[PDB]
Design a protein around this ligand. Structure first.
Ligand SMILES: C[S@@+](CC[C@H](N)C(=O)[O-])C[C@H]1O[C@@H](n2cnc3c(N)ncnc32)[C@H](O)[C@@H]1O
Ligand SMILES: [Zn+2]
Lengths: 106, 308, 218, 129, 75, 395
């Protein structure tokens, strides 16, 4: 019987899909047979690392549905996920609360 | 039954605290205020002068018979080489230190203080290693076993008999309750603790003359020795106790000296008393130290004796 | 006999001066320890790991190892509030035991859940009465809601080692995970390393020790 | 008891130190024979200082093209061979730190005598009383 | 009689057994209650690993005792 | 003991998981070797300096050869004696030096050669087996009075079988395993040979019960066989069990090692650039299970200690010695006799009673000792103690 290529490596993200995208995206003339697996592992690691902080935020905000504001918080509150997404803008993410100290009353 | 040999001790001077035989059954280290007497066995004595500023409470030999540690109330502890004078001055405590002992290898020394804490010192490099603050009371006795060197028991004046580790110093098991988890007037200070020869059972004496043997794996008492009249069971000093595993002994014995000059002998397996000695009644026996088939007893005076 | 006087004066004077130098304390009194000295004085004069990313990665790897093992079975799920900071327990000022942060933590961040056995209200009353009976007199009860309380006197987490202080640096909120209410402890203000975790009990004597402070836990 | 304990200090000063210095000094001529033969190329090997024989008649010509590998006074090397390290270079260093260790315990052990004496003066101060 | 089996994960199961049951019977009981095959588990009591062939009563186990179940985990 | 009392969840981990300490050596380390029990660490420094640290303090306890006879240049082998008393070492100074650790000022015995050394190995009696540089035969030095005797390219690594100490194994510089039967004193005939690769064998390790063997080829692979012996030391066969390698960047291996008795785990250290980690595979299935990730430099050597259960490895660029050990956290649950800690809110069930207020003679053996601990390490083995030297303490 068949056995999905993304299940032989303990991954959730599809490996046949990533392989077809690498093949038909015109990145190189030939694609190693283990490159899609590595890339899919890295993709699911990053998405889990951001979804975890998003869930932590949505829970510490007494909701139970991850929502764009929670992703904006999870990203801009980190320090390395902030450099990976320094140029992006997350639609409906608002901004991070911050007020300068020269402005706060004395 | 065990016959007497000779009361060689020097009963003149200040009061003596203890006398522990050397690990080869050859020497007797007795203490007096700011000095150490050394009796050979042969009949001769030598003397070592210390560097303390107060009378010291306990001293114990080294597994090679080449050093002596001493615990003086000047808040420091002094390890002196028997032949090359004083060697190291551990000066980290902030309270009168009481008891001391080091492990089978002489690689780390264990000190109990009134700071409500314990300290693990490094002998050779003279530096401190660890500090274990797990008491709100007077930590009066610490003891590592001889066959093992990984655990150490700790008794205080609040009943807490803790077990820690020499490698990392965490609390492994506590067999009793302090004031917060029992009726406050049920407390009973612990005087002297002692491991069995295989570190599986714990001998313990309290300030009501009882002598218990705990199964430190199950945490439950299994044997209790006592004097059926309560005349001197109630006591006030570190009235010596010890263990006597005879060479090819059937069942080892427990020995204790109460606030009289009395010394008892109980068969641990049967609890039936076998023999008692007195004076040979004059003063509270301050310490007993046994060995393969011998025993040195020291009363509150310079009164010193031994048996066989 | 010249040695007697000579070495006596030399060593004695040197040793007492050495003790004086080593004594930054107040030179408390005390005799030897063959005297039956209890000195049970009330006031004592003496004293008194990698990152979060590594931790979350190790936790997810362990949980997915469990989920890969699950093909052989339930009886294996984990308390979901694993995102807890590293703390420790040691002797404290406000009371005997206390909880010290092991690493510097920021503000508005989860620290630990206060976990114990769930009981109703009359059971809690009976239990606190019986504890007052046996000399416990140290309530560890916590109110989840009107008809349920957590009891951590005999079973619970190290969150039972956090003392009440008139000025807290940690608060306690009530999340609902899996549809059930639980008590989490958030960092109110920033907390540096080796700092005791203060927290306001709101009980409705006080060894507070705070600069500004009131004499009642009530 | 003590004269036996630290008369070995005098042993450690004199006897093994002169034997090892003589064994170290032999390597000078054992190096000089091979050096003068080599200067008249192949790396003069070791294994010729044992009794410092250098069993040879005329080293400038006994090494001559006829026989190359030191048939007599046999050094390990036949040619520029990396088989050995040719310990003839810096051989003294071994003996040098050898005698350096000699001198180190010498100073340490002299200090130990003084400490023993500092304790034994007090001994006869207590034994007189 | 009841004995306890404490799993690392935080779960304790209260198995019903008799002192005359073999340890193999105990492993079978843990399976038929929880579905864990006896081959993959590992039972520990009082610091000593319970030996595969012997019996429960060999270890003097009586009712309401607790003992630890660790898994011989793998890929 | 300290383990019987511990809970059997955090004490029965299968291998180290985090690094705890990082010894710094002033010289550069080249060889590591624990004592037969996890007591002493005999380091061989860069310039023949040989120190013996103690695992309770991590600071030196004895420097053999302080009087004389010490080593002068990089050391290449350190082998302890099963009791703990004697210690064999060999360096690039061509000399093999056996030290009696009851008088560690000077070497007890020593022999000299005509080439650098790769490794010395103990047999009991007193007889070692040595592999010399560039030579094609091993050496049996039964030096109770200093005699030496001899016994497919070259010979690099030797190792004696664990169960049958008469069997000897050796790997060649051309791919040949050669076995020997020490059926005599100084005459040994082979019993088996074969050639499994075309490159140099670099390591020959064997489990403690002769039921496994591993080989590190110069090719970037690790060959694991299941050896077995029989027939009065004549029956000998090999069955290929697994081959391990680095699938991503094809790095090379620097040293390999097994677990204690059944060898359920294989630990290897990588060699190429950007290689700072140790791999840990199983051996039954052969799948990767762990990667030790502590150091920041190429790691040369490895050593496992099963009593304290710690992995020790010396860096290459710096010269430090990192230690990965099992860590057990302090349990507050111990502070009282009945303080059981939970992780999640447990529910409570109550009997109808709770609302309604209101000789011994057990077997006791105090002189008997315990043979095996929780892990399964054999206690009661003779553990000789290195005598403390006081001369270097007064200053
Ligand atoms: C969660 S327990 C604190 C743990 C306690 N230190 C121990 O050693 O277990 C809270 C209880 O400790 C005592 N306590 C805590 N904080 C206190 C304070 N500031 N003043 C007085 N008692 C306090 C009270 O008995 C209170 O009910
Ligand atoms: Zn207050």
């Amino acid at each position: 019987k068949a056995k999905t290529r993304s299940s032989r490596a303990g991954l959730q993200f599809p490996v046949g899909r990533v392989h077809r995208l690498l093949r038909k995206g015109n990145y190189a003339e030939r694609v190693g047979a283990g490159a899609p697996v590595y890339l899919a592992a890295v993709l699911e690691y990053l998405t889990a690392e951001i979804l975890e902080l998003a869930g932590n935020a949505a829970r510490d905000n007494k909701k139970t549905r991850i929502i764009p504001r929670h992703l904006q918080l999870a990203v801009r509150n980190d320090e390395e996920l902030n450099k990976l997404l320094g140029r992006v803008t997350i639609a409906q993410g608002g901004v991070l609360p911050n007020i300068q100290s020269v402005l706060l009353p004395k | 039954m065990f016959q007497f040999v000779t009361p060689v001790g020097t009963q003149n001077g200040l009061k003596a605290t203890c006398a522990k035989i050397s690990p080869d059954g050859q020497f007797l280290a007795i203490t007096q205020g700011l000095n150490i007497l050394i009796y050979d066995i042969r009949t001769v004595s030598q003397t070592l002068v210390t560097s303390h500023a107060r009378p010291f409470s306990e001293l114990c030999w080294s597994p090679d018979g080449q050093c002596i540690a001493t615990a003086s109330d000047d808040f420091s502890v002094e390890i002196i080489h028997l032949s090359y004078g004083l060697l190291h001055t551990f000066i980290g405590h902030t309270a009168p230190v009481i008891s001391l002992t080091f492990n089978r290898k002489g690689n780390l020394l264990f000190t109990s203080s009134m700071d409500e804490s314990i300290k693990i010192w490094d002998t050779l490099n003279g530096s401190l290693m660890k500090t274990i603050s797990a008491h709100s009371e007077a930590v009066v006795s610490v003891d590592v076993p001889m066959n093992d060197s990984s655990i150490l028991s700790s008794g205080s004046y609040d009943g807490l008999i803790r077990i820690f580790d020499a490698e990392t110093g965490h609390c492994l098991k506590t067999l009793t309750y302090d004031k917060d988890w029992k009726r406050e007037n049920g407390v009973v200070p612990i005087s002297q603790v002692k491991f069995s020869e295989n570190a599986r059972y714990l001998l313990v004496k309290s300030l009501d003359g009882v002598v218990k043997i705990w199964d430190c794996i199950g945490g439950c008492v299994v044997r209790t020795f006592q004097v059926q009249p309560l005349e001197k069971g109630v006591l006030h000093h570190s009235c010596g106790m010890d263990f006597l595993n005879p060479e090819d002994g059937s069942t080892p014995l427990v020995i204790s000296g109460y606030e009289n000059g009395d010394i008892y002998c109980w068969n641990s397996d049967t609890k039936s008393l076998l023999q008692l000695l007195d004076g040979s009644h004059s003063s509270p026996v301050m310490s007993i130290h046994c060995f393969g088939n011998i025993m040195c007893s020291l009363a509150l005076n310079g009164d010193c004796c031994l048996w066989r | 006999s010249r040695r007697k006087v000579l070495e006596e004066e030399k060593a004695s004077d040197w040793q007492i001066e050495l003790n004086g130098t080593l004594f930054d304390s107040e030179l408390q009194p005390g005799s030897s320890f063959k005297a039956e000295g209890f000195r049970k004085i009330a006031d004592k004069l003496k004293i008194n790991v990698s990152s979060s990313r590594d931790n979350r990665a190790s936790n997810r790897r362990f949980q997915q190892d469990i989920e890969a093992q699950k093909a052989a079975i339930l009886l294996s799920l984990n308390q979901l509030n694993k995102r807890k900071k590293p703390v420790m327990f040691a002797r404290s000022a406000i009371h005997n035991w206390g909880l010290y942060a092991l690493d510097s933590i920021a503000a508005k961040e989860m620290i630990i859940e206060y976990v114990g056995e769930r009981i109703r209200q009359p059971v809690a009353e009976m239990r606190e009465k019986r504890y007052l009976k046996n000399g416990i007199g140290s309530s560890y009860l916590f109110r989840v809601d009107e008809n349920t309380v957590i009891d951590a006197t005999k079973k619970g987490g190290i969150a039972r080692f956090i003392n009440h202080c008139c000025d807290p640096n940690c608060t306690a909120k009530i999340i609902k995970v899996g549809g059930r209410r639980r008590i989490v402890i958030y960092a109110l203000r920033d907390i540096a390393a080796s700092e005791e975790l203060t927290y306001d009990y709101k009980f409705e004597p006080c060894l507070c020790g705070a600069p500004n402070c009131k004499g009642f836990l009530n | 008891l003590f004269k036996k304990k630290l008369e070995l200090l005098e042993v450690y000063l004199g006897w093994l130190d002169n034997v090892y210095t003589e064994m170290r000094k032999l390597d000078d001529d054992a190096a000089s024979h091979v050096e003068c033969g080599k200067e008249d190329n192949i790396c003069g090997y070791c294994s010729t200082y044992e009794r410092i024989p250098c069993s040879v008649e005329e080293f400038v010509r006994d090494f001559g093209s006829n026989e190359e590998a030191t048939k007599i006074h046999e050094v390990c090397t036949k040619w520029k061979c990396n088989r050995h390290l040719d310990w003839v270079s810096t051989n003294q260093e071994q003996y040098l730190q050898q005698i350096d260790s000699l001198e180190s315990m010498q100073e340490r052990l002299q200090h130990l005598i003084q400490a023993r004496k500092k304790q034994l003066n007090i001994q006869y101060y207590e034994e007189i009383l | 009689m009841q004995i306890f089996v404490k799993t690392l994960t935080g779960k304790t199961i209260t198995l019903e057994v008799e002192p005359s049951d073999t340890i193999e019977n105990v492993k079978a009981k843990i399976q038929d209650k929880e579905g864990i095959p006896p081959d993959q588990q590992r039972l520990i009591f009082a610091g000593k690993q319970l030996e595969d062939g012997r019996t429960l009563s060999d270890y003097n186990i009586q009712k309401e005792s607790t003992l630890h179940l660790v898994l011989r985990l793998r890929g | 003991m300290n383990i019987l009392l511990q809970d059997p969840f955090a004490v029965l981990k299968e291998h180290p998981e985090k690094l705890t300490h990082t010894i710094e050596n002033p010289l550069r380390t080249e060889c590591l070797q624990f004592s037969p029990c996890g007591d002493y660490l005999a380091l061989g420094c860069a310039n023949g300096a040989l120190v013996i640290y103690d695992m309770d303090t991590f600071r030196p306890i004895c420097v053999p050869g302080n009087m004389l006879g010490a080593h002068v240049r990089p050391i290449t082998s350190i082998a302890w004696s099963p009791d703990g008393r004697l210690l064999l070492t060999s360096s690039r100074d061509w000399s093999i030096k056996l030290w009696d650790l009851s008088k560690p000022s000077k070497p007890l015995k020593e022999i000299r050669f005509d080439s650098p050394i790769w490794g010395c190995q103990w047999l009991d009696r007193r007889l070692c087996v040595a592999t010399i540089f560039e030579e094609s035969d091993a050496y049996v030095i039964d030096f109770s009075n200093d005699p030496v005797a001899s016994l497919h390219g070259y010979v690099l690594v030797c190792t004696v079988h664990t169960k049958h100490p008469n069997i000897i194994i050796v790997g060649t510089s051309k791919g040949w395993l050669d076995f020997y039967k020490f059926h005599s004193l100084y005459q040994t005939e082979c019993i088996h040979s074969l050639k499994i690769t075309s490159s140099n064998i670099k390591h020959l390790i064997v489990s403690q019960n002769g039921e496994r063997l591993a080989i590190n080829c110069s090719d970037r692979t690790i060959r694991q066989y299941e050896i077995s012996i029989d027939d009065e030391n004549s029956a000998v066969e090999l069955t290929l069990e697994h081959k391990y390698q680095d699938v991503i960047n094809k790095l090379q291996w620097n040293c390999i090692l097994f677990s204690n008795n059944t060898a359920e785990y294989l630990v290897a250290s990588t060699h190429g650039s950007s290689a700072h980690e140790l791999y840990i595979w199983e051996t039954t299935s052969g799948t990767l299970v762990r990667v030790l990730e502590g150091a920041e430099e190429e790691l040369i050597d490895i050593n496992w200690d099963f009593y304290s259960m710690s992995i020790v490895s010396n860096g290459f660029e710096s010269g430090n010695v990192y230690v990965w050990s099992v860590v057990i956290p302090p349990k507050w649950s111990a502070l009282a006799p009945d303080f059981e800690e939970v992780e999640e809110n447990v529910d409570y069930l109550e009997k109808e009673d709770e609302f309604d207020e209101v000789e011994e003679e057990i077997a006791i053996d105090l002189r008997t000792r315990e043979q095996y601990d929780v892990r399964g390490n054999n206690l009661l083995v003779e553990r000789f103690t290195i005598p403390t030297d006081y001369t270097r303490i007064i200053k």
